[PDB]
Design an enzyme around this catalytic site. Structure first.
Site, PDB file in Angstrom:
ATOM      1  N   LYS A   1       0.819  -1.206   0.000  1.00  0.00           N
ATOM      2  CA  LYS A   1       0.000   0.000   0.000  1.00  0.00           C
ATOM      3  C   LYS A   1       0.855   1.259   0.000  1.00  0.00           C
ATOM      4  O   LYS A   1       0.855   2.019  -0.967  1.00  0.00           O
ATOM      5  CB  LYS A   1      -0.938   0.010   1.206  1.00  0.00           C
ATOM      6  CG  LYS A   1      -2.290  -0.622   0.942  1.00  0.00           C
ATOM      7  CD  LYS A   1      -2.950   0.003  -0.272  1.00  0.00           C
ATOM      8  CE  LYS A   1      -3.419   1.415   0.027  1.00  0.00           C
ATOM      9  NZ  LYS A   1      -3.557   2.221  -1.216  1.00  0.00           N
ATOM     10  N   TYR A   2       1.582   1.477   1.097  1.00  0.00           N
ATOM     11  CA  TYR A   2       2.401   2.678   1.213  1.00  0.00           C
ATOM     12  C   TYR A   2       3.482   2.720   0.144  1.00  0.00           C
ATOM     13  O   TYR A   2       3.708   3.762  -0.481  1.00  0.00           O
ATOM     14  CB  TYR A   2       3.025   2.749   2.605  1.00  0.00           C
ATOM     15  CG  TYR A   2       4.043   3.852   2.773  1.00  0.00           C
ATOM     16  CD1 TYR A   2       3.656   5.123   3.155  1.00  0.00           C
ATOM     17  CD2 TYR A   2       5.393   3.617   2.556  1.00  0.00           C
ATOM     18  CE1 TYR A   2       4.580   6.128   3.313  1.00  0.00           C
ATOM     19  CE2 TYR A   2       6.323   4.619   2.711  1.00  0.00           C
ATOM     20  CZ  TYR A   2       5.911   5.871   3.089  1.00  0.00           C
ATOM     21  OH  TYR A   2       6.835   6.875   3.245  1.00  0.00           O
ATOM     22  N   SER A   3       4.160   1.601  -0.085  1.00  0.00           N
ATOM     23  CA  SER A   3       5.289   1.560  -1.002  1.00  0.00           C
ATOM     24  C   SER A   3       4.879   1.321  -2.448  1.00  0.00           C
ATOM     25  O   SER A   3       5.743   1.327  -3.328  1.00  0.00           O
ATOM     26  CB  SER A   3       6.281   0.480  -0.563  1.00  0.00           C
ATOM     27  OG  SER A   3       6.524   0.555   0.831  1.00  0.00           O
ATOM     28  N   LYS A 130       5.888  -2.906  -6.571  1.00  0.00           N
ATOM     29  CA  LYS A 130       4.470  -3.022  -6.280  1.00  0.00           C
ATOM     30  C   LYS A 130       3.654  -2.228  -7.295  1.00  0.00           C
ATOM     31  O   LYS A 130       4.154  -1.320  -7.963  1.00  0.00           O
ATOM     32  CB  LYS A 130       4.168  -2.537  -4.863  1.00  0.00           C
ATOM     33  CG  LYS A 130       5.066  -3.139  -3.796  1.00  0.00           C
ATOM     34  CD  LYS A 130       4.253  -3.859  -2.731  1.00  0.00           C
ATOM     35  CE  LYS A 130       3.533  -2.878  -1.822  1.00  0.00           C
ATOM     36  NZ  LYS A 130       2.758  -3.573  -0.759  1.00  0.00           N
TER      37      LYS A 130
END
Lengths: 560, 244, 142
Positions: A1-3, A130
């Site tokens: 998510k964040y990355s 990602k």
């Protein structure tokens, strides 16, 4: 998510009707698409310079792809946007650009519309990072690519459904051309965003391409916790919350030093050099110091950080205050945001929700002592309960939670000079009301852009793509003085006559001997600070900035 | 200190104004000077940035051989100090123009910026512009809606937008200025709803317990029943304990 | 170990698109080094230095030849992980070409701005592991 980093793949048609268009001042659709892709690149490199962008022309005579497929060209593979990537694209703008594309790529060469979608999925599947989002815009001036061969249409539909199942959402930005047909046709079951629309058959204008709001050249997207603190209702019962910031000042990225000869970054090396005796110094023989008059206070490094430690990092609740006691005038820092998090303490969200409900029911705000880091002095905070507000489109605009409000100390409040209360009268407050009503304004947060940042970004764009002149930003915060004056009317003059009185317009050279004689003369007068400074510097005496410093030092030393 | 300017609406309507400074975060004036622990003298100590090349170090790289550079994408575009000064935004000095007027409900205490608040009082002792400004603030206060303002400190300082609420007291009458956020200055986040959740929905007993808690720790008493919220321990009058 | 090390891995840092083939270089350097288990007359002790450490086509010099390669500065870090633990054989008294390898390691220290616990703390165990097994020649180290 964040990355995860968002990814984008363009898909520009290159058909025969894609190139030839109406013979007027209107841009050919190919130039429109290239300009729009260039604009998207420019917007996405200044903002979030980590996403992946790639452009895959289809319908060309040449071919370049991982798996050999006819009439599909991958001009660029997935990578961060760069200046060279923009410059590799602007050569196709204009009639000369059209001819360059034709001689370098070609046109016609009927395609399949399926292998292109397969190719896009290939680059999407070739990334070692990602994939937060996967999108494929389809710039096209035609709406019924097939119809003479139903098999190709079925294969395209199957591949599109497969892409949607994989998690790839394509949305075509349709291009309008002369004629009468851009009908909702064999593209409706393909748009995997499936955006809501009237789906009107007889569209007669360019489709959702102006929706880009081209070149929104200011953004830095990110979401992070920024802290993870404990909210102590008492000494023993504590809950764990996170401290996010909703609005934060935006600054231009810091400059980088460069070596002029090679234009490569130069690393810096800051180190406290010798005491004019040679060697290097320890963090252990350099103590901090301060001087007050003739008294010198010598204090160690760690003891300097020891005198500003009061509480352990956390929010110590100290009571509840009515909302009507939180004045609007008092304000120091941008208001932070609190959300319940359940990584350090399990069960914080339930107590937090109960507290929020019963705190906004009684219109009260929690008062706490705030210490964000290990050695920061405490700072009182009023936690205002912010109730969730949602639009009809199920879009959250004010997420629920608690909002910090930094209450200033008495040290941070300044005192105004005494002023005399003079009040207006009727018959001109009414005039002011009429003017104000004539100057209505529906203020929105997404209204203005930082003119300095906009100018700096445009200058950088001009200096990276040699645009031969920087783009002049339309300063959105500049008042429309002529338009608002015309809209206002003559009542401004009625105002001016009503209150303003008729007469109220509102609108070296020095040496030894001259100083030796002058100290007895005692003036050192028209002698300017710039020349006192140069005298004390070139002569070598200690110098400051205030006049009295030099006037005393030179007088005391030169004679005595 | 005095800060003179002119609030202007349109082109010909101008009111002489004086924005005095107000609540602002205040720090410690003095500074800690590094001193060697042998003779307690600052002159012996000496620090300096030493720019060094990247490959196998170097003897030195001088100041005059250093130019600015700004990251732009994956590469670096060489800017320069003189180019920055030449091609950049140029305002027209201090300005307090009024963009317009919006209802005093579209601006919220959450969407504020800056480290300071201003109180645009009036002109100086001459009671000519004071009447006009008082009329403006009264028209804003008896009615609703608030004035947006384009404010700039000096020629060099960047221009900022903000709000000027009316502020009427039994002793003086003035507006107050606080900065607003720009488009790039705003951040939107996604948070799970705390009311539709089922796992964390608190039961009636918990609600009653926390209600009794907040009623017990109320920091304000409606003393004398005169509709006056007499205040218990207020945090806006305690001096900053850090300085003491 | 294999003489084809130059052909197989010096080609890697010659072509464009250095994003990728770092794992190929890792496989190459693992293959050239799986043979290090043998101890009966390796006959490559003097061969490696002229091939993996030489200023012409060495690998520790592939930091001066990696400076411009930012994408091949952490991939270079990951291959030089094993390239620098390659010295893990404390069963020999030989000290050939150690003098220049000392300052080569010093250069590796003063080259990389990142991976400070990955390239450093991975070098300078030549000191206290390979050097200071000395005081028999000791020409420059101290």
């Amino acid at each position: 998510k964040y990355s995860g980093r968002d990814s984008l793949i363009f898909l520009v048609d290159a058909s025969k009707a894609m190139f030839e268009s109406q013979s007027e001042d209107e841009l050919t659709p190919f130039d429109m698409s290239i300009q729009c892709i260039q604009s998207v690149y420019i917007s996405k490199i200044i903002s979030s310079d980590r996403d992946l962008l790639a452009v895959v022309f289809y319908g060309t005579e040449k071919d370049k792809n991982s798996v050999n497929f006819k009439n599909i060209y991958v001009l660029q593979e997935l990578d961060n946007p760069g200046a060279k990537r923009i410059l590799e694209l602007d050569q196709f703008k204009g009639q000369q650009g059209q001819k360059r594309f034709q001689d370098m790529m070609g046109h016609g060469s009927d395609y399949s519309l399926s292998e292109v979608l397969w190719v896009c999925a290939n680059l999407f599947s070739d990334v070692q990072f990602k994939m937060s989002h996967k999108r494929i815009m389809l710039f096209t001036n035609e709406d019924n690519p097939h119809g003479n061969d139903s098999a190709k249409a079925s294969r395209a539909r199957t591949k599109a459904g497969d892409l949607r199942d994989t998690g790839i959402f394509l949305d075509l930005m349709h291009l309008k051309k002369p004629g009468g047909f851009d009908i909702s046709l064999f593209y409706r079951d393909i748009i995997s965003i499936a955006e809501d629309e009237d789906l009107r058959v007889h569209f007669e204008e360019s489709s959702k391409l102006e929706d880009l709001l081209r070149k929104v050249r200011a953004k830095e997207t990110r979401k992070r916790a920024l802290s993870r603190l404990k909210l102590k209702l008492n000494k023993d019962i504590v809950i764990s919350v996170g401290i996010y910031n909703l609005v934060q000042k935006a600054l231009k990225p810091p400059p980088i030093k460069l070596y002029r000869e090679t234009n490569e970054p130069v690393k810096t090396k800051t180190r406290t050099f010798n005491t004019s005796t040679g060697g290097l110094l320890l963090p252990s023989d350099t103590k901090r110091s301060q001087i007050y008059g003739s008294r010198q206070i010598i204090l160690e490094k760690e003891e300097t950080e020891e005198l500003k430690r009061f509480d352990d990092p956390g929010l110590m609740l100290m009571g509840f205050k009515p909302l009507v006691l939180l004045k609007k005038h008092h304000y120091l820092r941008p208001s932070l945001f609190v959300y319940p998090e359940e990584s350090l303490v399990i069960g914080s969200s339930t107590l937090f929700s109960a507290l929020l409900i019963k705190c906004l029911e009684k219109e009260v705000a929690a008062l706490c002592r705030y210490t964000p880091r290990r050695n920061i002095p405490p700072y009182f905070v009023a936690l205002v309960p912010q109730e969730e507000e949602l639009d009809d489109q199920k879009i959250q605009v004010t997420p629920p939670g608690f909002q910090l409000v930094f209450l200033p100390f008495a040290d941070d409040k300044r005192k105004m000079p005494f002023t005399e209360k003079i009040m207006a009268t009727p018959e001109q407050v009414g005039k002011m009301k009429a003017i104000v009503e004539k100057l209505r304004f529906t203020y929105r947060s997404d209204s203005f852009e930082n003119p300095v940042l906009q100018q700096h970004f445009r200058n950088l764009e001009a200096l990276a793509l040699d645009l031969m002149e920087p783009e002049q930003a339309v300063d959105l915060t500049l008042p429309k003085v002529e338009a608002m004056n015309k809209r206002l009317g003559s009542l401004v003059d009625e105002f001016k006559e009503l209150v303003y009185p008729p007469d109220y317009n509102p609108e070296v050279e020095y040496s030894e001997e001259e100083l030796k004689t002058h100290i007895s003369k005692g003036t050192l007068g028209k002698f300017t600070v710039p020349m006192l400074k140069e005298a004390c510097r070139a002569y070598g005496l200690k110098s400051g900035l205030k006049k009295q410093e030099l006037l005393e030092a030179l007088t005391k030393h030169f004679q005595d | 200190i005095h800060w003179p300017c002119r609030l202007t609406i349109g082109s010909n309507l101008s009111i002489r104004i004086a924005a005095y400074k107000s609540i602002l975060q205040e720090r410690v004036k003095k500074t800690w000077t590094v001193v060697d622990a042998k003779t307690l003298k600052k002159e012996d100590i000496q620090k300096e940035t030493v720019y060094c090349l990247n490959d196998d170090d170097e003897t030195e790289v001088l100041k005059e051989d250093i130019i600015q550079g700004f990251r732009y994408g994956s590469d670096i575009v060489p800017f320069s100090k003189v180019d920055e000064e030449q091609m950049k935004y140029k305002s027209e000095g201090k300005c307090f123009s009024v963009l317009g007027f919006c209802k005093s409900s579209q601006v919220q205490r959450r969407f504020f910026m800056g480290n300071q608040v201003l109180k645009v009082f009036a002109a100086r002792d001459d009671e000519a512009a004071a009447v006009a400004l008082s009329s403006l603030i009264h028209a804003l206060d008896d009615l609703d809606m608030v004035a947006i303002v384009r404010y700039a400190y000096d020629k060099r300082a960047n221009p900022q937008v903000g709000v000027a609420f009316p502020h009427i007291k039994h002793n003086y009458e003035c507006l107050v200025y606080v900065q607003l956020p720009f488009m790039e200055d705003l951040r939107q986040y996604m948070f799970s709803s705390l009311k539709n959740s089922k796992k964390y929905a608190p039961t009636e007993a918990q609600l009653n317990a926390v209600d009794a808690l907040i009623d017990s720790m109320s920091l304000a008493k409606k003393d004398e029943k005169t509709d006056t919220l007499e205040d218990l321990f207020p945090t806006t009058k305690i001096p900053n304990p850090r300085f003491q | 170990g294999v003489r084809c090390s130059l052909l197989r891995l010096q080609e890697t840092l010659s072509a464009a698109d250095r994003c990728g083939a770092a794992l190929a270089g890792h496989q190459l350097i693992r293959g050239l080094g799986q043979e290090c288990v043998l101890s009966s007359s390796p006959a490559v002790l003097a061969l490696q230095t002229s091939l993996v450490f030489s200023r012409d086509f060495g690998l520790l010099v592939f930091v001066r030849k990696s400076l411009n390669s930012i994408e091949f500065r952490e991939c270079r870090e990951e291959i030089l992980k094993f390239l620098c633990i390659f010295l893990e054989k404390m069963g020999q008294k030989i000290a050939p070409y150690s003098v220049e390898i000392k300052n080569t390691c010093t250069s590796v220290y003063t080259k990389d701005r990142a991976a400070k616990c990955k390239i450093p703390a991975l070098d300078l165990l030549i000191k206290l592991l390979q050097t200071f097994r000395s005081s028999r020649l000791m020409d420059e180290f101290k």
